[PDB]
Design a protein around this ligand. Structure first.
Ligand code: FES
Length: 103
């Protein structure tokens, strides 16, 4: 199923920005990487931590706790302590707006 839901106006995403959004009740992180936007779940897989409070360095988001890192394009866990990949979501831009597929 692909079901596109509007997330933010794309002005809201500056360069190399991570932004936390809440869409249909779901907390998601939007990342800007070299002109593309990616989306993951906003909760770390290792603990209670929000990705959007972390540090985005190129395509790697560092959790605000523990030094765990994910690749934002694939969701792959990149270093200890994170071992479970983070869920990624399809993104597109329509206009104008950043849309996310929550299905
Ligand atoms: S809570 Fe994110 S690495 Fe531990």
């Amino acid at each position: 199923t692909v079901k596109w839901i509007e997330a933010v106006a794309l002005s809201d995403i500056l360069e190399g920005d991570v932004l936390g959004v809440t869409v249909e009740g779901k907390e998601l992180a939007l990342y800007e990487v070299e002109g593309e936007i990616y989306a993951t779940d906003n909760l770390c897989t290792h603990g209670s931590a929000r990705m959007s409070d972390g540090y985005l360095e190129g395509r790697e988001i560092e959790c605000p706790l523990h030094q765990g890192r994910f690749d934002v394009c694939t969701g792959k866990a990149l270093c200890a302590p994170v071992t479970q990949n983070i869920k990624t979501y399809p993104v597109k831009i329509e206009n104008l707006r950043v849309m996310i597929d929550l299905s």
